[PDB]
């Protein structure tokens, strides 16, 4: 743990005190005969690193709905807001991800900051359900199934497998 | 920030959650549609690193007098006890540092774990006060003083400087 210089009120001595760890602040500086005392950051406040400060930092305002906290206001961290899962941030607030329709599939997973990117299923794959998450699935292999392709598949359906 | 695997009670799904930062613990695991929620360690408790645990660690018992805390019980740290300044630990508890008598001086600064080490002042130095802190001081330079040595010094006194 590191140190900081402090000027002693009563004597004018420049002391070398021990820093307080992240999550605490200095509630009593060291003097020529006693060590500095650290206290924990009160509710509502934080300090990110080992410090010598006298009051902890204030946490930001609460997250504006529909945003939620991916980090809380705690001793060591300011609160951090995010759009909840299945939404992404655009301008002001939160929009739901694109839902890829049947016959399309996710090419790029949507994130808290970018929307999902869809592509039409390529030949040999299909997607049969609307989803903002699912990829195009490859057809069931009929050859390696001991069966044959009764009905071909489409970008929306699997091929159907059987005999004769 | 890192992650941890968790088995979802209702579905049996093995999820990948986000760890909670040091000083917090996981108060709600992530599910398939919502992020894990972190809470700050309650008073009395701590977590040292980013974790996935469900209750914070308990702080050790209070420091037995005359020991005092060089680190407090806080969100990020267990309390850490030390012998106060001017004492050092031996066996059970705390003993005051050796006080180097007049004519001796500190060779090794005393610490919270070792006592002071004294040596007799070497020729040309003196120490005129009992102290568990002070070094032998070199005599005042009479030559470079424009004065001469009226009375020689001793291991306890400075030489005294003047003219004629």
Curated annotation (Swiss-Prot), chains A, B:
Detected in fetal spinal cord and in brain neurons, with higher levels in brain from Alzheimer disease patients (at protein level). Highly expressed in heart, brain, placenta, pancreas, lymph node, thymus and prostate. Detected at lower levels in lung, skeletal muscle, kidney, testis, uterus, small intestine, colon, spleen, bone marrow and fetal liver. Very low levels were found in adult liver and peripheral blood leukocytes. Glycans are attached at residues 32, 91. It is found in: Cell membrane. Induction: Up-regulated by TNF. Keywords: Adaptive immunity, Apoptosis, Cell membrane, Disulfide bond, Glycoprotein, Host-virus interaction, Immunity, Lipoprotein, Membrane, Oxidation, Palmitate, Receptor, Repeat, Signal, Transmembrane, Transmembrane helix. The keyword Repressor does not apply. TNFR-Cys repeats lie at residues 1-38, 40-81, 83-117, 120-161. Changing residue 32 to Q: Abolishes one glycosylation site and reduces total N-glycosylation. Oxidized in response to reactive oxygen species (ROS), leading to endocytosis. Disulfide bonds join 17-30, 20-38, 41-56, 59-73, 63-81, 83-94, 100-118, 121-136, 142-161. GO terms for biological process: adaptive immune response; apoptotic process; axonal fasciculation; B cell apoptotic process; cellular response to tumor necrosis factor; humoral immune response; myelination; negative regulation of B cell proliferation. GO terms for cellular component: plasma membrane. The keyword Transmembrane applies. Associates with TRADD. Interacts with NGFR. Interacts with CASP8. (Microbial infection) Interacts with hepatitis C virus (HCV) non-structural protein 5A; this interaction allows the modulation by the virus of JNK, p38 MAPK, STAT3, and Akt signaling pathways in a DR6-dependent manner. Promotes apoptosis, possibly via a pathway that involves the activation of NF-kappa-B. Can also promote apoptosis mediated by BAX and by the release of cytochrome c from the mitochondria into the cytoplasm. Trophic-factor deprivation triggers the cleavage of surface APP by beta-secretase to release sAPP-beta which is further cleaved to release an N-terminal fragment of APP (N-APP). Negatively regulates oligodendrocyte survival, maturation and myelination. This is Tumor necrosis factor receptor superfamily member 21. The lineage of its organism: Eukaryota, Metazoa, Chordata, Craniata, Vertebrata. The gene is TNFRSF21.
């Amino acid at each position: 743990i590191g140190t900081y210089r402090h000027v002693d009120r009563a004597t004018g001595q420049v002391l070398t005190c021990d820093k307080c760890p992240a999550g605490t602040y200095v509630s009593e500086h060291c003097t020529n005969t006693s060590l500095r005392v650290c206290s924990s950051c009160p509710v509502g406040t934080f300090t990110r690193h080992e410090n010598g400060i006298e009051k902890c930092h204030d946490c930001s305002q609460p997250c504006p709905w529909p945003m939620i906290e991916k980090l809380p206001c705690a001793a060591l961290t300011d609160r951090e807001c995010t759009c909840p899962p299945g939404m992404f941030q655009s301008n002001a607030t939160c929009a739901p991800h694109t839902v890829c329709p049947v016959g399309w599939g996710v090419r790029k997973k949507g994130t808290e900051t970018e929307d999902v990117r869809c592509k039409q299923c390529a030949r040999g794959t299909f997607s049969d359900v609307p989803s903002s998450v699912m990829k195009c699935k490859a057809y069931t292999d009929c050859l390696s199934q001991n069966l044959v392709v009764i009905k071909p598949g489409t970008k929306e359906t699997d091929n159907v497998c059987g005999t004769l």
